[PDB]
Amino acid sequence: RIIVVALYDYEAIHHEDLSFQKGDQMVVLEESGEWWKARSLATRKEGYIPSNYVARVDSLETEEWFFKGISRKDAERQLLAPGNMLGSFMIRDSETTKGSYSLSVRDYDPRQGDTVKHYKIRTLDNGGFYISPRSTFSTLQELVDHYKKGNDGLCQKLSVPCMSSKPQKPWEKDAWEIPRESLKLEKKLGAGQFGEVWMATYNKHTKVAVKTMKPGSMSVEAFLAEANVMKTLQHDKLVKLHAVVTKEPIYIITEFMAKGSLLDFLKSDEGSKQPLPKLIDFSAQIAEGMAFIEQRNYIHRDLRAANILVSASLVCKIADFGLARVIEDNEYTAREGAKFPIKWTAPEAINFGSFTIKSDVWSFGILLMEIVTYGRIPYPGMSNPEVIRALERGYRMPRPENCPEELYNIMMRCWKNRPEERPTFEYIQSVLDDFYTATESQYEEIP
């Protein structure tokens, strides 16, 4: 007997699903990835349910102010998003103390502007919680109610929980290789050398993006072998692969991203107005996704701003990871021109075909420059031969206007001519995540 309660409003989209009215009760039979077999005791109809729409009945996951499964950096981004107020807050699982909790609170002061402060919630040996020893609580709900009545040493009195939206519904079960007829291509979003991108509807019920590869560009068996790896690369800063059509012309079906590529966005009316700290946050989000790719011993091979997508809520997601590996070189693709751009590519990849996570690090440095110039071509005024010969002699793009010196220093480290001298993405992620909050304590040492 394992009982679970619903969280959001969800109704059947497939055949044998159920329905949710923002609060019901369930007993799960078995599990199956993101979909679970559960039995209803409310309406007494039984069908599959999205596991991320429900919560374990004893746990904190029912509470509007608890955010399971998010990082400290996630927490800061979520709280600083528009729509939240002074004292907006969340409780989350602690990142540096397993089993315990952290409180994150939106703060403001005229010197530092909008910030998020973090507090350690300690667990008592015989039950209960505290932030300061003089104020203990039997439950986290009691803690929240206490600090909603007055700051009692915190930066702010707690106001309301961090805003959140209903999560994406999981992709249909057992629907990896799908029939072409299941997709209606609705609007062409982009055209390219080796394919197009469409907004589409899957089985009349789900909005997706579809990359449609040109005939002659890829083999089904070679593509599928790689796509079966790509689909396992799941991370908040990588675009999710939902499905594929494994017949030429090959289609790749992913989540739809409302603001297109980061290059498009930086060149748009809205994106050209992002302030420098937001640009640095974009850079950090991409570094986080590349650190994941690095941890997974994978190689992107074509990292550039045109291959970063931007969501409606301004989350950056890495796209086309690994795809260059399975685009074929033949008479069909040759007639479309250059396979990779010289200006983004590491010298050892150009000269010897040595593509590695370190050549991705080089490309990331070029991407940083694209970001801080809002989409300018790399090496303005220079031809491709000129760039190659200049790099050989120690030339690097100079620091542009409105570029923090430490960001430029990161670029220069990425552009070491020897690959082994370039930093890891783990390193880059750390420096960019902490770019402004360096020389500042992790947690607030409350009395």
For position 115 contacting ligand OOQ by CB under 6 A, the verdict is no
Euclidean distance between CA atoms 48 and 36, whole angstroms: 6
The residues near 361 (Cβ < 8 Å, ≥ 6 apart) are 414, 419, 422, 423, 424, 425, 428
- Tokens describing residue 239: 């675009």
| Residue from 82, 126, 191, 447 in contact with ligand OOQ (CB under 6 A) | 191
Are residues 258 and 312 in contact, defined by beta-carbon separation less than 8 angstroms? yes
Q: Which stretch binds ligand OOQ (CB under 6 A): 28-36, 130-138, 243-251, 259-267?
A: 259-267
Q: x/- string (CB under 6 A) for ligand OOQ, residues 223-242?
A: -------x--------x-x-
Euclidean distance between CA atoms 363 and 316, whole angstroms: 17
| Residue from 115, 217, 261, 285 in contact with ligand OOQ (CB under 6 A) | 261
The answer to whether the annotation marks 196 as part of a ligand binding site is yes
Residues contacting ligand OOQ: total by CB under 6 A: 21
For position 323 contacting ligand OOQ by CB under 6 A, the verdict is yes
Task: Tell me the residue number closest to ligand OOQ, measured at CB.
Answer: 190
Region of residue 367 (phi > 0: left; psi between -120 and 50: alpha; otherwise: beta)? alpha
- Tokens describing residue 6: 């619903």
| Residue from 211, 301, 304, 343 in contact with ligand OOQ (CB under 6 A) | 211
- Tokens describing residue 321: 């990871």
| Residue placing its CB nearer to ligand OOQ in the complex, 144 or 189 | 189
For position 257 contacting ligand OOQ by CB under 6 A, the verdict is yes
Nearest distance from C-beta of residue 84 to ligand OOQ, angstroms:
26
Q: Could you tell me the CA-to-CA distances from 423 to 111, 224, 393, 404, 410 in Å, in that order?
A: 33, 32, 21, 19, 9
The catalytic residue among 24, 264, 302, 320 is 302
Annotation says 74 is catalytic: no
Coil, strand, or helix at residue 93? strand
Indicate the angle between helix axes 357-372 and 405-414, nearest 10 degrees.
150
The answer to whether the annotation marks 189 as part of a ligand binding site is yes
| Residue from 55, 209, 287, 314 in contact with ligand OOQ (CB under 6 A) | 209
- Tokens describing residue 177: 């290789």
| Residue from 128, 153, 190, 404 in contact with ligand OOQ (CB under 6 A) | 190
| Residue placing its CB nearer to ligand OOQ in the complex, 190 or 249 | 190
Active site residues: 302
